[PDB]
Amino acid sequence: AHTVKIYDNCIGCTQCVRACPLDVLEMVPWDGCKAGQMASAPRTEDCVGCKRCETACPTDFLSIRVYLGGETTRSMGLAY
Amino acid sequence: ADVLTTCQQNEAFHKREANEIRQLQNRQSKYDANSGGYLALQAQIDQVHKRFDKYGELLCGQDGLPHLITDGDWRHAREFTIPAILFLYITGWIGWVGRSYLQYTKQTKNPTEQEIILDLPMAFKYMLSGFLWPLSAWQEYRSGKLLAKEDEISVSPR
Amino acid sequence: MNLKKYLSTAPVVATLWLFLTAGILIELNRFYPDSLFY
Amino acid sequence: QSPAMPFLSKPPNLSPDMPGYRGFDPLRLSDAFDVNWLLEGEVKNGRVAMLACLHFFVTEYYQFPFYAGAPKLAAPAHDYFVKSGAMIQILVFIGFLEMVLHRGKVLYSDMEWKGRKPGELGFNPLNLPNDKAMKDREINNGRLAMLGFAGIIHGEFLNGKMPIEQITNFQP
Amino acid sequence: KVKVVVDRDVVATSFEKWAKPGHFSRSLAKGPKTTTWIWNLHADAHDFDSHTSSLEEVSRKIFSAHFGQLAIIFIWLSGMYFHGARFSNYVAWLSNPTGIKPSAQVVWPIVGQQILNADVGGGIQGIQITSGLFQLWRASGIVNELQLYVTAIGGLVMAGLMMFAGWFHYHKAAPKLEWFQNVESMLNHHLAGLLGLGSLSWAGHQIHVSLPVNKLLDAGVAPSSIPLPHEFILNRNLMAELYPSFQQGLAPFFTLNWKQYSDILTFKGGLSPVTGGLWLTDVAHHHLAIAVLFIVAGHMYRTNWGIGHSMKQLLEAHKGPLTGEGHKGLYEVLTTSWHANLAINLAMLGSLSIIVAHHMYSMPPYPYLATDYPTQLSLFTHHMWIGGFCIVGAGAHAAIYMVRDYSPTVNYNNVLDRMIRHRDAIISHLNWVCIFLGTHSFGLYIHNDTMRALGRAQDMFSDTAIQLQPVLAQWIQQIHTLAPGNTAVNALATASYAFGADTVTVGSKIAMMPIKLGTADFMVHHIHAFTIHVTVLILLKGVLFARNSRLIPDKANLGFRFPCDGPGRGGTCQVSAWDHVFLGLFWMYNALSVVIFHFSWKMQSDVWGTVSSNGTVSHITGGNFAQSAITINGWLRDFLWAQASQVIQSYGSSLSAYGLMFLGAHFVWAFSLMFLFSGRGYWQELIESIVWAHNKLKVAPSIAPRALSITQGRAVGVAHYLLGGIATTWAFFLARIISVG
Amino acid sequence: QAPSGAAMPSMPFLKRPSKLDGSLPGGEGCFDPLGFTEVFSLEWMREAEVKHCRVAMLAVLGVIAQEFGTLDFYHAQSKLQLSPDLHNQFVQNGALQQVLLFVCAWEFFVGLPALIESLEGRREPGYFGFDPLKLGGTYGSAQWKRMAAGELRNGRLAMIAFGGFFHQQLLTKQGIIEQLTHF
Ligand code: CLA
Ligand code: CLA
């Protein structure tokens, strides 16, 4: 599976979660930023590693990071 | 030196002159004296003579072609050294006035707009001020205005 | 004034400056042909 | 509105206080370039052309030295004195004067007019009257000398003939 | 119902927006922060349906832009006529068509480039032209420079009028959407008005000007001594001397005694033995017959008078039990999408350019074209390339339609929907056919190279070993040879001498003769079948999977043109429809390169050449195609290596520009590989270090330097690949054929 | 009967052009049937008309004056003034080369600035304020309009006249005065 990590500079903009075509990510309550919420990656077993989440992340550098890992039927996006 | 001789005294060089005239005359033979074809080919024949006479003073290889010396020897200054100095004067001018204009644009309200839509009066001002760029550049260097500080320049993590 | 702004756009000034430059170099080679040295 | 060309609007950056103002700038070069530079350039090109026009006139029978015996033919003369190494001494001396008179600020970017209107290089040893219509008299003589000089050299290139001999009774 | 409706003074004529780069785009109007903006400005300038959501505003830009294109074409044509008038040996060439080389470009004497002013004859020195303009102008009856000058001036007036009309129909009188959607009216006018009256009015020129001028030229009358065209119209006795039917006037036309015009309107077939061109009486009659067909055809579609067909009713009627709702929706598709129309129109115009290439070499329509081998080779090759580019474009716009304009509601169980619903069956079968064709076409060459290298000539696919006779093509040649007096009873000769019958010579040079098909011809035809099927695979896959695949289920949302959907799913580089077009271009280049090489070699080997007094044909490459063109080594050695001799030996001659362009084109081709093989990540990182050095010297630009986009890298790559590859062949071909032809 | 609203005075059947209101000195007729002023700038067209008027008038008088007598030192072989033969001679003399220079000088340094001023709407087309002798009066008076109307009517006549001059000389191969005297 791929590894998806959320770093503390997340501003809780929700753009990564909206961008994810596999529903890997969700917004969770968090006091660390003014938005009152942080990206979370609970379903990385479904992550294809498309990095649409990183493309969407406005922080410099990225608050969400995708480390491509061991390939599976799911991660390779295979319908056979 | 047997490898290089003055082109004036080089037989291969004289042979090349003769060959180039002969080829032009072999073409000229198919035209009738007063014709444009004849006069055009005659013009080229006249310039062949003038060229080979001009390059006579250069050193020639055994090929009978002018070979340029670029080692700093003053006897060959006209071949490289003088053209080299002229090149650096012109391009130093281009670079300097370009830097001058670029520095002007960064003081304006929309610096990027002044890079794609030139302030022509300001461009002309800096372009006409390039003629003493080596002194201008020296004065900026001495005054600590030429270079940005290491502290102030963005770099990637090492 | 808008036409002059257009004529100040990068591609127009580049075209005109390089035309002028090319003209000077072409005309120098017309009058001083075959200059292999200074 | 322009006095010289009433059908055209007045060149905005020009002013009647400037010496030799007719509001004559149909190409609007006073919009393209700073007037103070153009003004300085005009009077200088004038002053140089003035001396050039006298040089050709006085070249007849007025102080020819033991280093004379050279033709007045423009291009052959230039080629001779460059080869001699006289023009290179004149170049550095004019280069010296330019730096001295302008006090370092020689560039179009650098040249400034703090307590001096364009043309005022602080050369008035006899102390003749300056701040008046005398500036307009310099300009008119300078403008005439620039066209004058152009008329001399083109006459010298056309039929290889002497400047002052032309205005006797000769046609091409 | 069919009405003219325009909006007046819709756009003010102001330079304001000229001084606002990227005014047309909401994304670009704000101006650059990076160099990417400069590229984007150009990439997006004509993508009108990205600028605005209004189909009306898109339509009006298109109509006005079209006038811009015609204006430019008129400047170019005008140029060609003016260069003919002012800088050509055309007049001299008319008096010696076989001896003088056409020339209409003279170079200035500077840096020694006047070497390119070749000894072309006719009292000028210039570049030998291969456009066939002289043969066109001779067919048109042009005999003097005044006629060419007046055409050039006429061209500039048409260019001016096109510019006025483009300006006028955008700024002053812009037609409404409902004007443009009059497809029935448009087709009636374009069929009857453009093609019908074009062909009728041209037939008029031919009968009144071309025919009499060319009959006198072919008889050997001095072009200066020929009466000016208007004298044939004014003095009917002049015309009646040449074509006696002109005695009877127009009475035989209105009374249906049409056989009286047997002199001016013929069905001779074959070629003039004098000019090696089609008989102009055949061409005049062709154009009359076509004109009638088109004027009749353009009465098909209903406009304002009840009569005629509804194209909507026609499409919806063509419904069978195997194809669901059939052609339901396609009328809506083609009246609401410019891209859909551009897709069809490019496919057909491209395919037409290719048909033109084949028809023009084999039935040389212009006098002294057939034996001007440079022109024959140039015209075939040129029209092949234009055709190839247009067909790939059809793929691009078909796919743009699928991404931007396609709706499931319009295309519900219609032929388009049903195609998408078995795209897997379509692409799997076409994939298979490509592997079958590739193995059994290219494999035969590799088999042959191997057998020849192993000293096993008796084990080869060849005319002298294991024969693959194109028996169906051979059989069709026979039928076309037997046609005149038989299945074409009133035809005196074959449509083309390419099929059989006689060898036509003009002077000593072969105009046309039977093109015999053997094993080498069978093999290269299966290469062409192969390269076309693969190109179709790439472009069709692009269209059918433009909106989604099993890999990218939401591909339509990512758009037509996007680099990838990231390295996940194993990697999704070049999934976009745009990337299929990118790959399609290389295969089109591959396919057409082999077509024009097949043409060049076959014509030189087996057709073009000299016929002696004895009457023995000596071909340019002496029949080496049959035994050399059945191995790749034969193509490398007997074609590229042997025929490149002219271009590489061109230095110090008038053809030296071809030598230079040959190397220049190789350079540009190789340079392309830098863009195609690399990725912008490398380049952006390099630029960071270069930007550092500029920052250090306080000379870094405010418009931040960026590496080209991933897509632009590909666009630059394929553009330089094609420019380099095509220009290399151009220099090769022209140097070769101007030398040996 | 006539059209509904304002009709063109010169052509009472055609509607009056929107821009031509009859106020202009030599434009009482409002004569624009092909509707050039409807699409093109009036200030441009007026500048062109008045320019053509002044060029044509000098040219028509030039032909007549040159026909009556030419200067000696200008060895004019052709008596036909609007012939290629004469034109070609005074190109090779450098006479037409000289007047081309000062015409080109005028057009670039005067005519083009003057045209741009008129398009901005800060100059009446044709106005260079040239009246040393004051045969027009004050700029904008009823006397000025009469002369302005006179200029165009004289210029329009010369423009057409020059057509007659050129074309008749091209057929007959005779002088304009020579043609009048001899049939
Ligand atoms: C004022 C403009 C200017 C100046 C002073 C410099 C100066 C420099 N460049 Mg840069 N460069 C420029 C423009 C300029 N460049 C532009 C427009 C590009 C994009 C093509 C580059 C791309 C570039 C690269 C890829 C590299 C440099 C490098 C360098 C450095 C080494 C010398 C060199 O290779 O120059 C020669 C530069 C080139 C051949 C690039 C093109 C230069 C253009 C044509 C000049 C443009 C002039 C400008 C339009 C003038 C307008 C002024 C007017 C409005 C008043 C030196 C700091 C090198 C470096 O980093 O060295 C440490 C290096 O590898 N430059
Ligand atoms: C007889 C009627 C007629 C003719 C001849 C044409 C011809 C043309 N139309 Mg079509 N058009 C028509 C009716 C006609 N249209 C009608 C009724 C509609 C609305 C239903 C359209 C809607 C339409 C659109 C939306 C577009 C066209 C376009 C075109 C051009 C296609 C490109 C081409 O082949 O260039 C061939 C070029 C020529 C033959 C040279 C120019 C010809 C000019 C325009 C005049 C031709 C007609 C004129 C009466 C000739 C007088 C002959 C003279 C001896 C008196 C072509 C000029 C396209 C275009 O390019 O527009 C600019 C385009 O986008 N047309």
Ligand code: CLA
């Ligand atoms: C010489 C260069 C080369 C070759 C050989 C190939 C080969 C192929 N390309 Mg590729 N292509 C190329 C360049 C090449 N391409 C380039 C430069 C690009 C970038 C533009 C592409 C982009 C591209 C695309 C986008 C597509 C292709 C496709 C194809 C396949 C076409 C179907 C086919 O004929 O398969 C059969 C194989 C051949 C014809 C090659 C040789 C066959 C030999 C002679 C016979 C079999 C030999 C035998 C089995 C060997 C046994 C030996 C072993 C035991 C040691 C084929 C595999 C298409 C495809 O996949 O179609 C289904 C496809 O869609 N190519």
Ligand code: CLA
């Ligand atoms: C030569 C250039 C020329 C130009 C630029 C103008 C321009 C103008 N005229 Mg003037 N006019 C001219 C010559 C010209 N005229 C001549 C010779 C006469 C005498 C007949 C007139 C008589 C006249 C009157 C009575 C009036 C004008 C008016 C005007 C103004 C409005 C009408 C217009 O837009 O015309 C644009 C004209 C052109 C663009 C030139 C014509 C171009 C065509 C295509 C030439 C060829 C047509 C055709 C082949 C001719 C022969 C056909 C047949 C009869 C044999 C405008 C400023 C009106 C005005 O308001 O005055 C202030 C007005 O009332 N004109």
Ligand SMILES: CC1=C(/C=C/C(C)=C/C=C/C(C)=C\C=C\C=C(C)\C=C\C=C(C)\C=C\C2=C(C)C[C@@H](O)CC2(C)C)C(C)(C)C[C@H](O)C1
């Ligand atoms: C001024 C200014 C610029 C500033 C550029 C500034 C910073 C440059 C920095 C240079 C660096 C720090 C070291 C430079 C090192 C110089 C090298 C080491 C040259 C050694 C000489 C060789 C060795 C010649 C030998 C020989 C000669 C002697 C004679 C020949 O004949 C034989 C050879 C064998 C060629 C710009 C860029 C903004 C543009 C603007 O426009 C003007």
Ligand SMILES: CC1=C(/C=C/C(C)=C\C=C\C(C)=C\C=C\C=C(C)\C=C\C=C(C)\C=C\C2=C(C)C[C@@H](O)CC2(C)C)C(C)(C)C[C@H](O)C1
């Ligand atoms: C090329 C040639 C050169 C000279 C060429 C050059 C200048 C010649 C140009 C000819 C022009 C001026 C013809 C003008 C055509 C006049 C039209 C045709 C009049 C309008 C139509 C009427 C009919 C309407 C009027 C009326 C209307 C308005 C109102 C009504 O009430 C009354 C009527 C009366 C009908 C050279 C010399 C330099 C040398 C070169 O080597 C050869």
Ligand SMILES: CC1=C(C/C=C(\C)CCC[C@H](C)CCC[C@H](C)CCCC(C)C)C(=O)c2ccccc2C1=O
């Ligand atoms: C070489 C290369 C680059 C580097 C090339 C770049 C950035 C383009 C170079 C820009 C050229 C040189 C034009 C810039 C010139 C300026 C406009 C200045 C002009 C000055 C005068 C001529 C007017 C990529 O960015 C890239 C991206 C993706 C895949 C492959 C590649 C790739 O192969």
Ligand code: SF4
């Ligand atoms: S896009 Fe980036 S900043 Fe926004 S919620 Fe996701 S990780 Fe946080």
Ligand code: SF4
């Ligand atoms: S290599 Fe380039 S094109 Fe391929 S997935 Fe990565 S970013 Fe996208």
